[PDB]
């Protein structure tokens, strides 16, 4: 019966492939050919925040577009003030091997995690005038790659044990487990309506999940190597990925296939992070060749280059109002562009 | 600037003073990476070693230096996504078991991966060959033909040790890398000094390379 069930997989595989071709009558580049080009985008460095003594691995903006949080291998968690270049808090960490961080939408909590296989929650606005550990979440069997907040009592995490999970902070227990990947999960993006999210893993595939029901809806496979970054379109009906094959791709949900590919013949290094603009016209990506590129999301043309770092660029971010872009690197510095 | 603004900048300056003080203390430390297979001697490599899953960290003080050892064996995942964290380490310690005839060809394969990694082009390796008392009490019963079918030579213990060590040294293809070998037993209690000598010779070579002689 194993052979019959193995063959039934191939029968259902060709049906999905044939259905996608039946709904593909034109390409995005063909439709968008009669559009004026964006032009040349030039951005200058306005702020240079310094104080970290090792590599920076992650950062996250606040909702007010004023405050930041960054994580480094020196066991520190610093909250910055963009406008005046000031330090507000400095949080020591029990473990120095941290790989991700996040900022709560309400501005009351932050989180971090890494090779200790634990996600930690911190309380910022409290009496006694100091930051204190509020909760430690345990249960994963691999390192944490990413985490994002839904509200003050819910969080979603991805791990290197090929699983995703949804936690309740007060009870400290999982409520749903997301399974189906065959490789380590590296990235995670959350929809604006907080009802769906997507993930990218080392098996060169992306999956779309439903939070309420905990089941997989669609799967996307176009890359030739592992995926390092992922992000939604501002509308909520498309997303973009970045892989180690030196390529970014755009996927659509309703048509359920790929639309555009962003590649150049003189780029060999991989991609660390991706981000969009407020109108969804510019796509920003970070690379291992010390540079950050700006792409045209519709014409698939290169529009600008940001070059100010002496080491690998590892994290990106765009504010809610779309007024500035902040980049972090392995040279223990981060800059704000406008 | 307002009165409350001048009070904010003073708080920032005191924070920057604390960070600078913490960096100086952490700079005068020696960091080492501990690697090997299961049940090989990683956990009991130094008798005076204290502990202070994910990653296990142990530390000890010898002479006037502080040593930090990191063991990462509980990470049963892909190594290529987190191996670059330990890029600025001083050296690598690799432990192998001579008695286990089945752990070999897995220790050798793992040795080849780390020794030819992109992030460890110029990182020295200290090699430990454990359980020499059991190896000399097993070679008579098992003439090394199980682990190495293509082996011709005397069945003496000394010749077997020289053959195993040469197999591990054959995986090095680099001109700025050296391997220090040492054979130890379970009852031996002289291993902090062996690491002290190996680290001392590494810094001397590093300083010579900066001058340009070597």
């Amino acid at each position, epitope marked *: 019966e194993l052979d019959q069930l193995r063959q039934e997989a191939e029968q259902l595989k060709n049906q999905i492939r044939d259905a996608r071709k039946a709904c593909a009558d034109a390409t995005l580049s063909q439709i968008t050919n009669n559009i004026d080009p964006v032009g040349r985008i030039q951005m200058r460095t306005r702020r240079t925040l310094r104080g970290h003594l090792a590599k920076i691995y992650a950062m996250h903006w606040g909702t007010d577009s*004023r*405050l930041l949080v960054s994580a480094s291998q020196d066991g520190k968690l610093i909250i910055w*003030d963009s406008y005046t270049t*000031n330090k*507000v808090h400095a949080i020591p960490l029990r473990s120095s091997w941290v790989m991700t961080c996040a900022y709560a939408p309400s501005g009351n909590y932050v989180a971090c995690g890494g090779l200790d296989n634990i996600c930690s929650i911190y309380n910022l606005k409290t*009496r*006694e*005038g*100091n930051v204190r550990v509020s909760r430690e979440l345990a249960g994963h069997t691999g390192y944490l790659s990413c985490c994002r907040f839904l509200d003050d009592n819910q969080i979603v995490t991805s791990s290197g044990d090929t699983t995703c999970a949804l936690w309740d902070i007060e009870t400290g227990q999982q409520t749903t487990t997301f399974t189906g990947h065959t490789g380590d999960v590296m990235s995670l993006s959350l929809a604006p309506d907080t009802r769906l999210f997507v993930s990218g893993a080392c098996d060169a595939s992306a999956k779309l999940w439903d939070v309420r029901e905990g089941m997989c809806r669609q799967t996307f496979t176009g890359h030739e190597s592992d995926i390092n970054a992922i992000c939604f379109f501002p509308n909520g009906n498309a997303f973009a990925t970045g892989s180690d094959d030196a390529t970014c791709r755009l996927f659509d949900l309703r048509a359920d296939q790929e639309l555009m590919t962003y590649s150049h013949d003189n780029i060999i290094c991989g991609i660390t992070s991706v981000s969009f603009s407020k109108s969804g016209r510019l796509l920003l990506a970070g690379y291992d060749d010390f540079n950050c590129n700006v792409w045209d999301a519709l014409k698939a043309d290169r529009a600008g280059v940001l070059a100010g770092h002496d080491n690998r660029v590892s994290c990106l971010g765009v504010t809610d109002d779309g007024m500035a872009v902040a980049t972090g690197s392995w040279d223990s510095f981060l800059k704000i562009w406008n | 600037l*307002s*009165a*409350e*603004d001048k*009070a*904010a900048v*003073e*708080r920032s300056k*005191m924070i920057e003073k604390n960070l600078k003080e913490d960096g100086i203390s952490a700079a005068k430390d020696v960091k080492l990476l501990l690697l090997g297979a299961d049940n090989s001697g990683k956990s009991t490599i130094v008798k005076q070693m204290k502990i202070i899953t994910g990653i296990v960290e142990t530390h000890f003080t010898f002479k006037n230096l502080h040593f930090r050892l990191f063991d990462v064996g509980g990470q049963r995942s892909e190594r290529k996504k987190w191996i670059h964290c330990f890029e600025d380490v001083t050296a690598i310690i690799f432990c192998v078991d001579l008695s286990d005839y089945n752990r070999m060809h897995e220790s050798l394969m793992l040795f080849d991966s780390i020794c030819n990694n992109k992030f460890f082009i110029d990182t020295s390796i200290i090699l430990f060959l454990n359980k020499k008392d059991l190896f000399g009490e097993k070679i008579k019963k098992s003439p090394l033909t199980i682990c190495f079918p293509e082996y011709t030579g005397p069945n003496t213990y000394e010749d077997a040790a020289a053959y195993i060590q040469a197999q591990f040294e054959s995986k090095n293809r680099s001109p700025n890398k050296e391997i220090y070998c040492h054979m130890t037993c379970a009852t031996d209690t002289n291993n902090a000094q062996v690491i002290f000598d190996a680290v001392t010779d590494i810094i001397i070579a590093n300083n010579l390379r900066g001058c340009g002689l070597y």
Partner: single-chain antibody
Amino acid sequence: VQLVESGGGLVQPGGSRKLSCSASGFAFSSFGMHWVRQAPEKGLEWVAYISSGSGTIYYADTVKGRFTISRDDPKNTLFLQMTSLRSEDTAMYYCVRSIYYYGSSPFDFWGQGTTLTVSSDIVMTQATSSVPVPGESVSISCRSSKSLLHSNGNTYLYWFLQRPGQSPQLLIYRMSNLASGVPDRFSGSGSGTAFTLTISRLEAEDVGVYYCMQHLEYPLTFGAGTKLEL
């Protein structure tokens, strides 16, 4: 959080006295401290201030050259040394904590004080003194000689409430932000040189004296105070 002050007594004119305050419940070394005194039948008056880390010290013009302020972090204690005491120094002295960073609420905790018996500034005006008033809306006004709005977009005005027999409590900081633990029926709004505090659905535990205070520049100055009766 607790702040207990010790000292006090009766001292002849020309003498000296030392006052101390103890802290228990919060990170002491991260907070700045103030001394504020109130005459037996008058309002509030700022005296001295020492920064977190002991780098900035400020004094009022009345007590300059006679008073000295100091702190001892490991023992969590604040001191005030007084010399050449006159008859105008008879008052009740308070200890106030304040922390300064983006988004903080200074002057958020006061401590019960001690009584001592010895026997180019901004003017803040509270025209009204007493207003008789449950289940009603009341408004209190305030005025300043100099505009309290800075070029960064911040207006510095603080509202305090002091019930009889109790220390003052913070109500509104900046100009409109509501302090933690305060019911949502208190609102604060205004413009340059004109400010108003509004209470909706008045209830019990709302009778007392309301004070203005500006934090634009040193020395800090208060208002006369408006009293609610019945």
